[PDB]
Motif scaffolding. Sequence first.
Motif, PDB file in Angstrom:
ATOM      1  N   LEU A  77      -3.284   2.605 -11.128  1.00 54.68           N
ATOM      2  CA  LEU A  77      -3.223   3.099 -12.517  1.00 54.68           C
ATOM      3  C   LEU A  77      -2.301   4.299 -12.630  1.00 54.68           C
ATOM      4  N   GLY A  78      -2.697   5.385 -11.969  1.00 57.56           N
ATOM      5  CA  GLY A  78      -1.891   6.596 -11.848  1.00 57.56           C
ATOM      6  C   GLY A  78      -0.432   6.379 -11.467  1.00 57.56           C
ATOM      7  N   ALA A  79      -0.191   5.390 -10.606  1.00 58.43           N
ATOM      8  CA  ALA A  79       1.174   4.993 -10.226  1.00 58.43           C
ATOM      9  C   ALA A  79       1.884   4.124 -11.271  1.00 58.43           C
ATOM     10  N   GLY A  80       1.143   3.677 -12.284  1.00 58.10           N
ATOM     11  CA  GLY A  80       1.686   2.810 -13.322  1.00 58.10           C
ATOM     12  C   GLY A  80       1.308   1.328 -13.262  1.00 58.10           C
ATOM     13  N   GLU A 117      -7.566   2.326  -9.127  1.00 54.27           N
ATOM     14  CA  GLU A 117      -7.532   3.630  -9.815  1.00 54.27           C
ATOM     15  C   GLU A 117      -6.315   4.475  -9.407  1.00 54.27           C
ATOM     16  N   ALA A 118      -5.964   4.445  -8.126  1.00 48.36           N
ATOM     17  CA  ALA A 118      -4.748   5.124  -7.692  1.00 48.36           C
ATOM     18  C   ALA A 118      -3.528   4.422  -8.271  1.00 48.36           C
ATOM     19  N   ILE A 147       2.282   3.841  -1.655  1.00 46.32           N
ATOM     20  CA  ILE A 147       2.182   4.576  -2.912  1.00 46.32           C
ATOM     21  C   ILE A 147       3.461   5.291  -3.322  1.00 46.32           C
ATOM     22  N   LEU A 155     -10.208  -1.641  -4.546  1.00 51.40           N
ATOM     23  CA  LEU A 155     -10.199  -0.438  -3.707  1.00 51.40           C
ATOM     24  C   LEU A 155      -8.997   0.439  -4.017  1.00 51.40           C
ATOM     25  N   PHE A 156      -8.036  -0.118  -4.740  1.00 56.11           N
ATOM     26  CA  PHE A 156      -6.761   0.537  -4.955  1.00 56.11           C
ATOM     27  C   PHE A 156      -6.436   0.713  -6.427  1.00 56.11           C
ATOM     28  N   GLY A 196       0.809  -1.202   0.000  1.00 56.28           N
ATOM     29  CA  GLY A 196       0.000   0.000   0.000  1.00 56.28           C
ATOM     30  C   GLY A 196       0.848   1.260   0.000  1.00 56.28           C
TER      31      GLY A 196
END
Lengths: 303, 301, 303, 304
Positions: free
Chosen positions: A203-206, A200-201, A172, A197-198, A170
């Motif tokens: 995605l943004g992180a790759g 979409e965030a 990030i 739950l995680f 978790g």
Amino acid sequence: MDPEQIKTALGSGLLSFPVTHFDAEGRFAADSYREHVEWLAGYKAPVLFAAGGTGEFFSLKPDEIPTIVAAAKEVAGETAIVSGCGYGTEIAVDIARSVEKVGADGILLLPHYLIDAPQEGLYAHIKKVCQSVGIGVMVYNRDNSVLQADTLARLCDECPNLVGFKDGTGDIGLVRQITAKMGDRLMYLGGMPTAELFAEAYLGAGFTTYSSAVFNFVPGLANEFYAALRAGERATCERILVDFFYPFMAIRNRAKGYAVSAVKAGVRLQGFNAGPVRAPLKDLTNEEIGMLEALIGTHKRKA
Amino acid sequence: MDPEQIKTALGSGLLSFPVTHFDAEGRFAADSYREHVEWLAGYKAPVLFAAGGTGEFFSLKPDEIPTIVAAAKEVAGETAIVSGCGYGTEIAVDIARSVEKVGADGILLLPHYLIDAPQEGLYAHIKKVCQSVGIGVMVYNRDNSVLQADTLARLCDECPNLVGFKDGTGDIGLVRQITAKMGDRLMYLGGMPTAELFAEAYLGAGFTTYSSAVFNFVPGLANEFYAALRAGERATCERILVDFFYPFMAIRNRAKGYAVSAVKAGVRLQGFNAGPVRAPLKDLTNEEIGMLEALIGTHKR
Amino acid sequence: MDPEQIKTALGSGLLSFPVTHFDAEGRFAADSYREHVEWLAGYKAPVLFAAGGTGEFFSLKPDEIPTIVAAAKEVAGETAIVSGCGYGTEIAVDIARSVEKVGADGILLLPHYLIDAPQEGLYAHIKKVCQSVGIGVMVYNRDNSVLQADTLARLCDECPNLVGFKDGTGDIGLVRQITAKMGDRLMYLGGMPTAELFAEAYLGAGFTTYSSAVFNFVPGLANEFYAALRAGERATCERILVDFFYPFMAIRNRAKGYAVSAVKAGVRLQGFNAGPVRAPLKDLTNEEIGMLEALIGTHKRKA
Amino acid sequence: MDPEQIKTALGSGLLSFPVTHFDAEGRFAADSYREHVEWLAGYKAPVLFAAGGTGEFFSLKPDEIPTIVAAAKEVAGETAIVSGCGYGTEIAVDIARSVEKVGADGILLLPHYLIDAPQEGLYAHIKKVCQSVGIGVMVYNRDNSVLQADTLARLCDECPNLVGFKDGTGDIGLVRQITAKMGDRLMYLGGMPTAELFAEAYLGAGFTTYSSAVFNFVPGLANEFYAALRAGERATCERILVDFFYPFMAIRNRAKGYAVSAVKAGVRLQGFNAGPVRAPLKDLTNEEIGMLEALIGTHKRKAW
Ligand SMILES: *[C@@H](CCCC(=O)O)C(=O)O
Ligand SMILES: *[C@@H](CCCC(=O)O)C(=O)O
Ligand SMILES: *[C@@H](CCCC(=O)O)C(=O)O
Ligand SMILES: *[C@H](CCCC(=O)O)C(=O)O
């Protein structure tokens, strides 16, 4: 399957971790397993992790693991099969080689056992496990085994069959540093419990894919959330999160271990004879199972 | 302005948190602060948080806070000014009212002091603070004060001037549940130390915007990252992360408090007499200052 | 007092921290405060901590603290009076001086506000607060303010009025090293919530005495336990723990902050007009007061 | 022996955990192992734990553990020999029976593997391992396996051969509750790494004794700290804490895992070729080994 091929498959869709089926006496139930794995097949997950943490790896005897991998392989079809691996180096190496022989397409290397270990020792541990086999290896940051970006880069340079990274921390800030540093050198897999739950965030992180434990019992819903994710359909993801995943979260958060126990309860409710968990997990109460069945609701598989 | 006008401004771009300047004597240095703040508003940050965490709120007397907000507001220009707030409820209220009276456009409520608290306690505390003023309040999740989604939605129903949420937990599961729950009832502000490290994932989690500490001394670079972020330039974001922000974190992680202290050192290096940090923070060694100096490099004011 | 005098008093008996009475609105209710304190004075505690953690220092205005302290030492008798202190350096000195000018026999320096800080920073902060007054200072290891032994030794060697050490960490290894390194240069006060659960262990670690919060409402029991502890009566200590303290722990553990809340519910149960806690604490539900009442039982104060 | 006899031996003195010796190739090295253990015998620890955590249990193949227990049994004399055991229920049971078979006097059950688990699961797992053998069993609170008092009570009521409790949490509040509730139903062992740092508080909390990793390489010093503790020689204990244990602590805190690596390095410095640690532990640097050798100082067993 060579390491580059399992690597490609890892990046081609949603990842599923079948629960491991036990009879009343806690022995592996291979007929029930294959039945469940044949059913999951129809939803076309590109990779199946046999005997991961959702499959109660941490309770399997080491000579049970090749048997469970081969059962999955019988009915998996054109789906890549990855096997759980872990413990200390000596045991992990013996497991890794046992499942390579039964045709595994790669291994998922869960943490070593018990101790906190310096980055030096981690590097030394994983390098030897990766060098023990010719098949693809995915490492797995969680709990007592958390590779730093510098250390992971050293393993990647030295071990060509090391092709994937599963996150269960978790963290990030750390995982974005890792994808920035390594780039396409590795496939990045979200592995938090209830990873939707995680997603979409991440995605943004790759991270463009994750393990979906709930796919075990509501694959149609999991496939839909994933397709919505990749298409940028945020209202659809949000609806599925509020209607299903947060309520599932509240059932899961009622006891330690329920990230595995609630999932296997869901399998059983959908008519698969998955059986009990092995201690020291405990199974859901009747009340809790009742709350789960109600949540599954319109996505019930039979009557 | 009114709560809804700060809400809109809060989501309209990159946010900044100016460090608070001190002098030899140790008192607030107002003209220095004013010349620093004025330089920042020329880099077009829509909102400025005077005496926030990065502005060492935790080390500020209640009486000092309205003088800093006054100083900021003097040269803020078109930029709106939100004031730090905090401590226990009684002091928090007293502080809230003082900064409203000198024209704070809003309140960033830092967590209460010392203790752990039940959700029903945090509710009563935050409710009481919101209701003692008419301007907009942004709550702040971190440390000993972490609002759950249901408690938060309860506050939002109760107090219409609560218009913003700032995260400093990095609990990415919780903050996606908060945005999913509340929707556009709130503006969502990324507030991790060195938030650029978390910005791409915070946006995936649905966050309106975030705050840049390093904007204090390299606002041009902070603006460059922010624009590449909004326009989808992932590779440019990556370059700035790799070349600047991860080397900055290596300096920051050398000691506790450096999330503030290294930012402050950044400010001085660019010619603003920001002075030292107040105890129990410590200033960077001369070695570390030189590292940071070397890292700023091309951006040297 | 002089520093050496409060030092001496600190080590000669069982200490306690009177809850701060508020009316139902509510600010400081000095009438109810004094009668509650006067009833506690008859139980012969030698040092009294006015406006400490148990007395909700963290929710007090800096103005209310001298008032509370003066209210305390009016009825205290020959009992010594130590004031809470805390927050950042600037506010801390202001409070320190405030309470010295109304006669406080010393100050308990509660942790600074919010941030994590370097040892050097903790040094500069506590040094300046010690040099702002002439009365005795006891430091308080807890949360974001944890002094290591080398750091603490330096403060002892710079500030002669620094004479006490309260632990709130429960870190055994650390506080044993502190008492080993400093010897009789410091008086060591055990300071966990419900410190009786820890008293038998903190003696072995070298701790002079401890703080009893429940002294507030069952000061007979606290003196019975403290006496056995000093006489080496293990079986008697063990009874009171099994009978009172671990049951009281089950209630105290029901909700965050109840280490004060359950203590203030106990004071009100014995007829003292304490009133509510200030937010973000909360008060026990009626059911929980019921629970507490049953436990207090025979120790119930009666006319 | 039976469970009550091992219960007694467990309560009768200072306990220790010999490192496991490996050759340069990481294989078990039984020659060197028995040599070192024969030396630890002269110092009369009443109970010896073979393949415990200090003995790198977490890095041993299950089939190695009976061989190790047998080697130490050759030269242990009248010292009780207890075996490490652990992992999840199936593996733990196999190990438990394997070492019962080569004649171990009891087992120490390290935590299960990887997962946080509910109290009900811990009960079920520990109960099944106990019921698999007839020998004495000691439970071990640490990390992902922390039994509450009420849970331990039911295991005690259900499993007579469960006779001991080792603590690795440092949770003084919880271990006091545990001794208050169970009484002499169990013997209590302090098990923090470098337990002498904790010994005085733990006796206070009512712990029957403790286990000394550093006894591996300065057993004379460990023995004297232990006699001083039992006699209430507070100044003696304090002198040894300041002159040796806090300095050792500073070496040990330079990296993760050095709670075992630093001890193995000390054994090597004393002329027993214990060999390297297995990954993911790492060995002390030559520099750090230098610091350890100078700390050992007057307590050197040899000249090099
Ligand atoms: C990784 C995926 C985490 C989900 C779960 O544990 O249920 C794994 O199972 O190994
Ligand atoms: C909140 C965190 C803001 C960091 C920044 O300046 O970007 C605070 O400092 O109060
Ligand atoms: C328990 C004693 C802890 C000491 C250490 O880990 O070095 C054990 O070794 O099993
Ligand atoms: C000291 C801590 C006393 C806690 C207890 O005994 O429960 C303080 O409140 O400052």
